[PDB]
């Protein structure tokens, strides 16, 4: 006979959607409450209850995900909000009379200038040390009269040192009503179905570390190196590479700085590098040589699959045009470095003596590209020594060539958000639709 309708509540049916997510951290105690808020967050569960699934297929897309935009927005909003009640360095841009450091024939210079005091009529004269990348001449014809770099265009605020910039794990946990699906394929080329799919309460820890031309402290691959992109046959998309074994890298600044605090007004303070005591030397960074050559051999052997079984692979240094996406830029120990990376992509491939790299240091940075804002950085006392696991690579394909088998590769700084795409390519938020209709025989007694 004919059939009737039935409504089911609790049926497993999902639909690709998007929404907001909140913080999730683990129970930890400490000079605390860094820029990433910890007290105003949810303590995660002790053990995540990962649940496996079978006979389930669905699609993915790492270049159209919506979690990375929300993560970037949250990061920038938090970084902006954690700098409002801090000190403002308005009267710092007084003209300078800065001299050379008496090292005969140089990186830093001693500058002396006038500064106010708590009493509105008194004027003191103080001296400090400034790096060569934070000073621009004003006369040029030809005497030495220097000024800062940022207060020709934008304002400047200090970063009072009661907070820290050390990255900490942050779990993104979906609200009640949604779910997250994790793919566990060992050959996930970036887009397409994934056989092994699991459902977890929410993700693991993520270290929001900022880096250019080289990922850091990421997640290691398995059994192979991964070479991912969106479209390989066009020179308009950065190509991501993930290693299978982390390479050790040691950056060091052997100087011995001193923090010198001076008054700038009633209730304010201004820190500077008062003096350098010891040996004036350039901050450097070391990387192992044999492991680097082995990793480059592995990555070129893996990359040969996409460009014919017999081609010439060459590397070249950055093209140029900036100070942030030409060198290798990162932060550690409370200081921002800029280490040249030309001594790495200087080989040519066809068919215990470690490597060294110089590094420069900036203080007045303009990170998180914007207008009207510039963040000063306080100096760190003592010495700094940062060990890291370089794992990633970001490479633009090449320019246009007539015809050959010798295409080159040049590294270039990405869009300051692809660092998280090496960690959020196996996650996807989804909603639940517990309603549905099904046909079968029923006759509800009217009685």
């Amino acid at each position, epitope marked *: 006979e004919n059939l009737w309708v039935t409504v089911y509540y609790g049926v497993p049916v999902w639909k690709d959607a998007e929404t907001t997510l909140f913080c999730a951290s683990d129970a930890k105690a400490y000079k605390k409450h860094n820029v990433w808020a910890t007290h105003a967050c949810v303590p995660t569960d002790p053990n995540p209850q990962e649940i496996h699934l079978e006979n389930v297929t669905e699609e993915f897309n790492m270049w159209k995900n919506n979690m990375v935009e929300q993560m970037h927005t949250d990061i920038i909003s938090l970084w902006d909000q954690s700098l409002k009640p801090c000190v403002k360095l308005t009267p710092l841009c007084v003209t300078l009379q800065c001299t050379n450091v008496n090292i005969t024939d140089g990186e830093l210079k001693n500058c002396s200038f006038n500064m106010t005091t708590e009493l509105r009529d008194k004027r003191q004269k103080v001296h400090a040390l400034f790096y060569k990348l934070d000073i621009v001449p004003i006369n040029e014809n030809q005497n030495t009269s220097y000024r800062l770099i940022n207060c020709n265009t934008a304002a400047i605020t200090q970063a009072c040192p009661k907070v820290s910039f050390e990255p900490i794990p942050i779990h993104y946990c979906a609200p009640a009503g949604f779910a997250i699906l994790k793919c566990k394929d060992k050959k996930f080329n970036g887009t397409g179905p994934c056989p092994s799919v699991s459902t977890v309460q929410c993700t693991h820890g993520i270290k929001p570390v900022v880096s250019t031309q080289l990922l850091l402290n990421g997640s290691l691959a398995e059994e192979e190196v991964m070479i991912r992109s969106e479209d390989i046959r066009n020179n*308009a998309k950065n190509i991501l590479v993930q290693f299978n074994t982390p390479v050790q890298i040691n950056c060091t600044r052997p100087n011995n700085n001193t923090r010198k605090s001076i008054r700038i007004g009633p209730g304010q303070w201004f820190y500077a590098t008062g003096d350098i005591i010891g040996d004036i030397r350039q901050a450097h960074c070391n990387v192992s040589k044999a492991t680097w050559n082995e990793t480059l051999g592995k990555v070129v052997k893996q990359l040969r699959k996409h460009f014919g079984n017999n081609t010439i692979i060459r590397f070249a240094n950055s093209s140029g045009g*900036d100070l942030e*996406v030409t060198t290798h830029s990162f932060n550690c120990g409370g200081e921002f470095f800029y280490c040249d990376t030309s001594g790495l992509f200087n080989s040519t491939w066809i068919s215990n003596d470690s490597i060294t790299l110089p590094c420069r240091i900036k203080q007045i940075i303009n990170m998180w590209q914007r207008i009207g804002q510039a963040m000063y950085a306080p100096p760190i006392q003592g010495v700094i020594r940062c060990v890291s696991n370089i794992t990633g690579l970001i490479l633009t394909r090449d*320019g246009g*060539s*007539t015809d050959s088998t010798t295409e080159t590769f040049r590294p270039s700084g990405g869009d300051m958000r692809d660092n998280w795409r090496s960690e959020l390519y196996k996650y996807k938020v989804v909603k639940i639709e517990p309603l549905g209709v099904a046909p079968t025989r029923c006759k509800r007694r009217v009685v």
Partner: antibody
Amino acid sequence: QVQLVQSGAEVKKPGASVKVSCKASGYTFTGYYMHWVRQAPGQGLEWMGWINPNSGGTNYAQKFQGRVTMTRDTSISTAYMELSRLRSDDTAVYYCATQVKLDSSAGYPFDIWGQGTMVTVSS
Amino acid sequence: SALTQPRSVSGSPGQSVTISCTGTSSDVGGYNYVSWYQQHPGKAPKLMIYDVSKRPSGVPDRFSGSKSGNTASLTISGLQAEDEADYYCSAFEYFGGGTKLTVLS
């Protein structure tokens, strides 16, 4: 309106450096790439390179490798193009193109163009 | 490698005309979605049809292209007295030689 203006250039002598400009208006300038293309009189087109005004990251073909420099001044939303050590076969017309409006998300192909400037040299 | 195309093809008023060009299929593969540009004499070129099987806004669809199994073609249906311009095919970065479409006075 979405458009691109340029500045006409005079004939230059061999061994000199040319200065090419390209000024946009309307749409936001720090969101999309910008390419440079050349057209020889009586021949086909040839691509020169592409600059990203957001971060100054450039990439140009190998035919002009080591002879062209591309900069950007986002304070006034203008671009630049320099080229020294010229020859006689570089007599052409130059164009700056973008991809402001298209349904697809890929960088190619570009649709909107500008006026263009014809640069030629005389010994 | 590169894309090639015939230098010039004849055309009569009113008659529908065609232009077809394609290099080696190993680089094309049928999915690069070659575009088509119109180069006017002494003017600024403009896009006639982007990647494939789709027409952009602002241009009439009286003449359009298609992609066969091994060759991309462009059919000009209802030729008129305003088609005196060169036609170029363009890949992501590669370009063609050039085609001229002439009419009879």
